[PDB]
TrEMBL record, chain A:
Region forming the signal peptide: none
Name of the protein described by the UniProt record: AFR344Cp
Residues of the full protein shown: 1 to 112 of 293
Subcellular location: Endoplasmic reticulum membrane
Family: Belongs to the SEC20 family.
Species of provenance: Eremothecium gossypii (strain ATCC 10895 / CBS 109.51 / FGSC 9923 / NRRL Y-1056)
TrEMBL record, chain B:
The name this protein goes by in its record: ADL286Wp
Gene3D superfamilies noted in UniProt: Dsl1p vesicle tethering complex, Tip20p subunit, domain A, Dsl1p vesicle tethering complex, Tip20p subunit, domain B, Dsl1p vesicle tethering complex, Tip20p subunit, domain C, Dsl1p vesicle tethering complex, Tip20p subunit, domain D, Dsl1p vesicle tethering complex, Tip20p subunit, domain E
Species in which this protein is naturally found: Eremothecium gossypii (strain ATCC 10895 / CBS 109.51 / FGSC 9923 / NRRL Y-1056) (Yeast)
Domain of life: Eukaryota
Pfam families reported for this sequence: RINT1_TIP1
GO cellular component: Dsl1/NZR complex
């Protein structure tokens, strides 16, 4: 919704669901790339929000969620590229 | 070592004696000879024996070739007049089976054009093709003809010549029937091709380029429309013809690029960034078929095309920007600011373009081809561009903030000169008359910045950096240099919220620590006007000294001041007096 951490929370689920479409029409790869771009942007926003909460700790859960989300995006690109390859291999041997 | 030559040429001289008896030699004997001669092949001592054995196989295959080709043509097996049935197909499969068995006995391995069964299967097409056709549009028409024939005959001929018992698989028939049907097209095309590759005229060199490009296109369509995982017409392209095509394509791309990096003295515009982006997309649309074709002796140029176009050109473009323009010394301050905004926009736009390229399938594949041949552990080929772009983005972002803040320091000079904050007539209804100019300027500035697209987090970064610089300006140049009325302070708070308002900050969210501190300092400042019991105690100059070393254990809990430092709380309290 409004908060960055819940936007990222939902967008992670969405991005994971795109990998297994119950559709028939395969991957919506352009929408997936658009989502990962938005995920990166929102990540940066959450990072800035956490950073700018103490001037120049009890902000540990936010840092943990941030780290695990950055690791998620990094692995998700590998998962996506794999799925993209698999989807064209499958639609050549049919 | 010589004990294996006078002994080797003994079996090798008995092979020639059994070969000298061509008749009264059944297929079994041909296998026995293959068994003996096979090891000694390529020796070059047994080369004569090979040459004889192969030309014997060929003579043993000449008659079933004429028969299979006659039967295929005289029964019209590739038209609607023929159906595949246990009776009308029986003899065809015998003649083709024997031809295949004979071809597999060739030493050391049969040539591509020696698979006699497939040559016969393709003969009908060869005659139809040569009859109907006696450049790019020609090659396209050849594909149209080839495709129609393949469509209505490929799976039919697979149903006809399937023979698991003799090794003729369905996968093999699918590959080879297409390959051999393709051979008369290779020969026809490669005549006009070698006819052009023997000229240095520009008209020629371009006609050769277009020819090669059309070959790539048709090979691609063949792989897609009929699921063909064999060689197309790419076999015709020699390394000398590729070098020509590759250089023509890189030259075309650089020529377009250089017409965009021509330094005008006018303020930079987004269009140039979008046009370079379109250049990269168009050049990728053109190079897509070539990239998708899987020939190993092609990788050498595919990497060359990837680097020189999709790495080098983006890097050079970054340096197109960030570049000393003595022609741009006549720019306004607000013009230099917008010029930088546009630069950062363009750069990040090309970045996302490359991000999209990095997930298209052809790139993923030839990225692994590169990670395998060069043994370089690249995640994406664009890592070297992104990491080089991420630097320039910071330099640009910092430049925007600095140039913006420098201007704000300038427009607040009037508002800075005002010193009557201790004698305020009434409560605030509008903004301080000397701040109106700055507020207007700051709105003009955020509107200029907002003209263009940036990633959400980079927007937040720049605008927060300015909220902080606004706070520092208000605190050091105004607050920490005056003492305030009841409504003087209310007026200042108004002024601050007006300046924060002009940034159009992504709001309804949380607040920065620096702003929380700002309003805590205001909150303390505001005890000068409420005569509470627990406020006369705190607003004592001696309470400040006597409690400063406790970090104001009392005051912190009483007033929820949790972002100010000891010295800061002290200065606020002292400022109330």
């Amino acid at each position: 919704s409004m908060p960055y951490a819940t936007q990222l929370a939902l967008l992670q689920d969405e991005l994971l669901d795109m990998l297994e479409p119950r559709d028939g029409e395969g991957l919506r790869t352009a929408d997936i790339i658009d989502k990962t771009l938005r995920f990166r942007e929102l990540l940066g926003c959450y990072r800035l929000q956490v950073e700018k909460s103490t001037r120049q700790a009890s902000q540990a859960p936010a840092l943990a969620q941030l780290l695990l989300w950055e690791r998620f995006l990094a692995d998700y690109r590998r998962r996506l590229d794999a799925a993209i390859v698999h989807e064209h291999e499958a639609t050549a041997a049919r | 070592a010589g004990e294996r030559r006078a002994q080797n040429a003994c079996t090798l001289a008995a092979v020639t004696e059994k070969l000298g008896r061509a008749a009264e030699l059944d297929y079994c004997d041909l296998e026995a000879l293959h068994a003996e001669l096979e090891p000694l092949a390529r020796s070059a001592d047994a080369a004569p024996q090979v040459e004889q054995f192969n030309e014997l196989l060929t003579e043993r295959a000449r008659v079933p070739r004429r028969d299979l080709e006659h039967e295929l043509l005289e029964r019209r097996c590739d038209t609607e007049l023929f159906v595949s049935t246990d009776d009308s197909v029986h003899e065809l499969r015998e003649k083709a089976g024997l031809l295949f068995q004979l071809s597999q006995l060739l030493l050391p391995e049969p040539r591509a054009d020696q698979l006699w069964n497939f040559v016969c299967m393709a003969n009908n097409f060869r005659i139809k093709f040569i009859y109907h056709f006696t450049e790019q549009q020609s090659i396209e028409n050849y594909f149209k003809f080839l495709d129609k024939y393949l469509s209505e005959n490929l799976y039919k001929y697979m149903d006809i010549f399937e023979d698991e018992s003799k090794g003729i698989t369905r996968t093999l028939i699918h590959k080879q029937f297409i390959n051999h049907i393709l051979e008369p097209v290779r020969e026809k095309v490669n005549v006009t091709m070698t006819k052009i590759a023997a000229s240095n005229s520009a008209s020629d060199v371009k006609m050769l380029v277009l020819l090669i490009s059309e070959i790539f296109i048709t090979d691609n369509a063949l792989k897609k429309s009929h699921y063909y995982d064999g060689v197309g017409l790419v076999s015709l392209i020699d390394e000398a013809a590729l070098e020509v095509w590759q250089n023509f394509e890189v030259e075309s791309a650089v020529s377009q690029f250089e017409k965009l990096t021509t330094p005008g003295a006018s303020l930079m515009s987004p269009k140039n960034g979008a046009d370079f982006g379109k250049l990269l997309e168009n050049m990728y649309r053109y190079l897509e078929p070539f990239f998708s074709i899987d020939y190993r002796n092609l990788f050498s140029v595919k990497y060359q095309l990837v680097d020189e176009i999709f790495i080098q050109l983006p890097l050079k473009y970054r340096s197109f920007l960030l570049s000393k323009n003595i022609l741009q010394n006549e720019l306004t301050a607000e013009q230099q600011f917008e010029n930088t905004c546009v630069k950062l926009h363009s750069l990040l736009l090309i970045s996302n373009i490359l991000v999209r390229f990095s997930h298209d399938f052809t790139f993923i594949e030839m990225t692994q081809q590169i990670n395998k041949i060069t043994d370089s552990d690249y995640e994406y080929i664009f890592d070297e561009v992104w990491e080089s772009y991420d630097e320039a983005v910071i330099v640009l972002r910092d430049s925007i903030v600095h140039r913006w803040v420098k201007g704000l320091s300038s427009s607040l000079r009037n508002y800075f000169k005002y010193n009557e904050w201790d004698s305020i007539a009434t409560a605030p209804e509008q903004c301080s008359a000397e701040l109106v100019g700055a507020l207007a300027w700051m709105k003009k500035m955020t509107d200029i910045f907002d003209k263009y697209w940036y990633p959400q987090h980079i927007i937040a970064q720049i605008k927060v950096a300015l909220l902080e610089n606004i706070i520092k300006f208000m605190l050091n140049y105004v607050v920490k240099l005056n003492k305030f009325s009841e409504n003087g302070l209310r007026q200042l708070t108004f002024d601050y919220e007006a300046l924060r308002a002009t940034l159009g900050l992504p709001l309804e969210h949380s607040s920065v620590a620096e702003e929380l501190a700002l309003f805590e300092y205001f909150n303390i400042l505001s005890m000068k006007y409420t005569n509470n019991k627990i406020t006369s105690k705190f607003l004592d100059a001696e309470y400040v000294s006597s409690h400063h070393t406790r970090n104001f254990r009392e005051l912190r809990e009483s007033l929820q001041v949790s972002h100010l430092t000891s010295d800061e709380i002290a200065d606020a309290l002292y400022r109330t007096l």
